[PDB]
Amino acid sequence: NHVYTRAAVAADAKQCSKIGRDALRDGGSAVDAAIAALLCVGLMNAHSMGIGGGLFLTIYNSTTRKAEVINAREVAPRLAFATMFNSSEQSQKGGLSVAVPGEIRGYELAHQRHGRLPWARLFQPSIQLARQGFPVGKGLAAALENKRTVIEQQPVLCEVFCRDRKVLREGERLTLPQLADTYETLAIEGAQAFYNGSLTAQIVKDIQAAGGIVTAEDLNNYRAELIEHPLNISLGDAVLYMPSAPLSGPVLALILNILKGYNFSRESVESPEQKGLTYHRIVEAFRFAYAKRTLLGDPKFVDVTEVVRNMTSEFFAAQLRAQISDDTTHPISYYKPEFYTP
Amino acid sequence: TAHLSVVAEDGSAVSATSTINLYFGSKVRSPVSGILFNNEMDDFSSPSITNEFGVPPSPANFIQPGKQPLSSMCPTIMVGQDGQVRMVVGAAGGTQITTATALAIIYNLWFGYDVKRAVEEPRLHNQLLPNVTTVERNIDQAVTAALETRHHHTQIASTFIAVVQAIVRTAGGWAAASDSRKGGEPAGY
Ligand SMILES: *[C@@H]1O[C@H](CO)[C@@H](O)[C@H](O)[C@H]1NC(C)=O
Ligand SMILES: *[C@@H]1O[C@H](CO)[C@@H](O)[C@H](O)[C@H]1NC(C)=O
Ligand SMILES: *[C@@H]1O[C@H](CO)[C@@H](O)[C@H](O)[C@H]1NC(C)=O
Ligand SMILES: *[C@@H]1O[C@H](CO)[C@@H](O)[C@H](O)[C@H]1NC(C)=O
Ligand SMILES: *[C@@H]1O[C@H](CO)[C@@H](O)[C@H](O)[C@H]1NC(C)=O
Ligand SMILES: *[C@@H]1O[C@H](CO)[C@@H](O)[C@H](O)[C@H]1NC(C)=O
Ligand SMILES: [Cl-]
Ligand SMILES: [Cl-]
Ligand code: NA
């Protein structure tokens, strides 16, 4: 049941939750624990996230009572352009599909602002895990099976993800010895090693060799961004902090604002008559909220100010709730999906 | 995609969601560094690529140099009027992230389900286009019937809908839950 009197980490792999917890016990901040745990998930779920990707953190300081967001999502390289892909396969595989990784700049910014433990300490348990290896978990095993063909026919992937030329199965040992060395370099040399240091030329070489266009200048210029005022909504006596565009906080805000007007409670699910109507109303709120999603984009490049103002407005939400019919769903056009600002 | 939730002894908290996008990202692994590179460029819309029958590309989310692609991620922290964290929650699952994060919040805050039940409770999803409601395998079939009599077309998810990690403050301290759909477990003290 995992109730804890002092502190808690909930990650998607048991060993990574324990690594986060150990950081907390050793005097780390919530940010130290999150970074140490994320470094571990990057190994245990290497198919899902890692230092080749990007992340967002929502952080709340109990003392100042302030929340902030750190934006370390990947960005299109300087040589990218709107018509660079003509098929889904071009946009999904190979070096041209790679955006500039932001993960390590994100960890650095968060740790500069909120760290208590030394940077190298955050990497130590993951360097050990990558060298000694670990049993393949359920999620990774499923992904390996789903991608077996691709994996098995690519020697650089089969190097770590196969055993005797076949993909690893759940319970079999995976070791990540090159990543262990990379994590050690990052721990010793800092985030600079990735973006403007000893790893940078090799990153560019690997991406370009696979047909990509990321350059050293792209890595040098990458910056994580501090957002001092995250999106928020009021729910009852609480405030919900979440990222705005380019993430989906505005969609979540609109869903909850539409639904808060129904005053759901445990009675809403106490009988099938009530429970059925309640779930209908939830699905309709999703449909209204997703109609508005296609206007969203990076707010540095697209003007989303009005869209986001509507999506976070309780009054706009009440106008949409008034259009939810208790007896029927409606065709797509009813929800007014929009691809251009009206 | 991975979602992690943390609450420290001083009451500070982090909700973090991270991704390389599709399974094994671009499928480009460095033979020297071992880094597996993302395929996040696939999260942009492109004028020449149609992903769903009758759905046009979204120009707001076209590629530009230096631009970030739209994301479904939503790492959230709910804080009470007294300044103490109430809930730390987020999800993995592509476009299902936003609906599953909504459900976990609804389930705990309004229906009164404890955190583990809020995470384990069956979910459903609709994103307007496509025009179908996906429900998980073990959803209350009275819900399925209530949706279908109201003219929703439902289909059962072949695996599951999203993965949620969450921590909620209780009288007992911090109650944590990792989603069994992925097989995580929390840790704490
Ligand atoms: C897609 O087509 C445009 C116009 O011909 C071209 O500039 C671009 O390089 C093409 N992309 C690929 C990956 O073939
Ligand atoms: C929270 O804010 C207080 C007051 O400014 C500060 O002393 C402390 O370092 C902060 N905690 C973290 C983890 O940033
Ligand atoms: C480091 O930064 C400067 C300018 O950003 C550049 O001249 C140099 O090539 C960089 N080094 C690496 C390894 O990227
Ligand atoms: C919620 O949203 C905005 C920040 O732009 C502001 O009006 C208000 O101070 C915020 N509320 C809280 C509790 O941070
Ligand atoms: C915002 O909502 C109002 C109605 O409440 C509407 O007039 C307007 O078109 C909306 N603006 C945008 C950019 O969607
Ligand atoms: C979508 O499903 C609804 C629900 O039955 C139906 O009214 C509508 O015709 C369907 N098609 C479109 C294009 O909205
Ligand atoms: Cl490796
Ligand atoms: Cl996850
Ligand atoms: Na639990």
Author numbering:
A (entry chain A): 35 to 376
B (entry chain B): 381 to 569
Describing publication, verbatim:
The structure of the ACPB-bound hGGT1 crystals showed that ACPB was covalently bound to the enzyme, and the phenoxy group on the phosphate of ACPB was no longer present. The data show that the phosphorous atom of ACPB formed a covalent bond with side-chain oxygen of Thr-381, the catalytic nucleophile for hGGT1-catalyzed reactions. This covalent bond with phosphorous is analogous to the covalent acyl bond that forms transiently between the C5 carbon of γ-glutamyl substrates and side-chain oxygen of Thr-381 during cleavage of the γ-glutamyl bond. The second oxygen atom of the PO3 group (O3 with a double bond to P) interacts via hydrogen bonds with the main-chain nitrogen atoms of Gly-473 and Gly-474 (2.78 Å and 2.64 Å, respectively). The binding of ACPB locks the active site into a conformation that corresponds to the hGGT1 enzyme–substrate tetrahedral intermediate. Refinement of our data showed that both LαSp-ACPB and DαSp-ACPB were bound in the hGGT1 crystals. In the final model with Rwork and Rfree of 15.3 and 18.9, respectively, the inhibitor was modeled as 70% in the Lα isoform and 30% in the Dα isoform.
γ-glutamyl transpeptidase (GGT1, aka γ-glutamyl transferase) is a cell surface enzyme that cleaves extracellular glutathione (GSH), GSH S-conjugates, and other γ-glutamyl compounds. We previously reported the crystal structure of hGGT1. hGGT1 is translated as a single polypeptide chain, which folds and autocleaves into two subunits with Thr-381 as the N-terminus of the small subunit. The side-chain oxygen of Thr-381 is the nucleophile in hGGT1-catalyzed reactions. Briefly, an oxyanion hole (Gly-473 and Gly-474) facilitates the attack of the side-chain oxygen of Thr-381 on C5 (carboxyl carbon) of the substrate’s γ-glutamyl group.
